[PDB]
C-alpha cells in the first residue's frame, strides 16, 4: 500500500547550508532498500554535496497548491541552468566527464 500512496507525490530535499536557490529541489521519491537517501549524482553540483558523510533533509508538501509548486517550479528537470550565469549545473562533471 505504501508504494501506491508514494506514486506521484514529490518531496523536497534540503541541504544545509542552503547557499543559493537550488539548495532545495523537488524530486519524485521511490522506495529503496536500506537506510540512506539515494540522491541523483547530477544535482551534486547544485547542492555542493560530496558523499563524505553529508546529510539531507526530506520535507513533504501537503496541500494541492504545495504539490503543484513542487511539481512545476522546484522539480529537478526544470532547474538545469544556474540562476547566476545560466550555465548548466546538471552538466556532466568529474567521472562522467572523464568517461
Amino acid at each position: 500500500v505504501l508504494e501506491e500512496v508514494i506514486a506521484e507525490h514529490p518531496v523536497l530535499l534540503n541541504r544545509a547550508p542552503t547557499l543559493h536557490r537550488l539548495g532545495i529541489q523537488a524530486f519524485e521519491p521511490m522506495l529503496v532498500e536500506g537506510k540512506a537517501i539515494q540522491l541523483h549524482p547530477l544535482v551534486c553540483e547544485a547542492f555542493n554535496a560530496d558523499f563524505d558523510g553529508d546529510q539531507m533533509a526530506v520535507h513533504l508538501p501537503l496541500s494541492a497548491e504545495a504539490q503543484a509548486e513542487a511539481r512545476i517550479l522546484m522539480l529537478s528537470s526544470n532547474n538545469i541552468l544556474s540562476p547566476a550565469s545560466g550555465r548548466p549545473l546538471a552538466m556532466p562533471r568529474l567521472d562522467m566527464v572523464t568517461g
Binding site: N14, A16, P17, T18, L19, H20, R21, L22, G23, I24, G34, K35, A36, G53, Q55, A57, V58, H59, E69, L73, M74, P83
Partner: protein, 49 residues
Amino acid sequence: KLHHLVDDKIHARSTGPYSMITQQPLGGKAQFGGQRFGEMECWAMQAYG
C-alpha cells in the same frame, strides 16, 4: 569503520512532541522533532516564488 552509522542518523517525524512556550515541534533525534527550515531555506523558497 567510522562511528557515523546510518542507524544513528536516519530520522523522521509525522507528528510528535511539541515545545512549551512556543508551540513549535521539538528538536533532536533523542525526541522526534523536525528539521529547522531555517532562514536561508526560506530565502531559497522565496526566490523560487
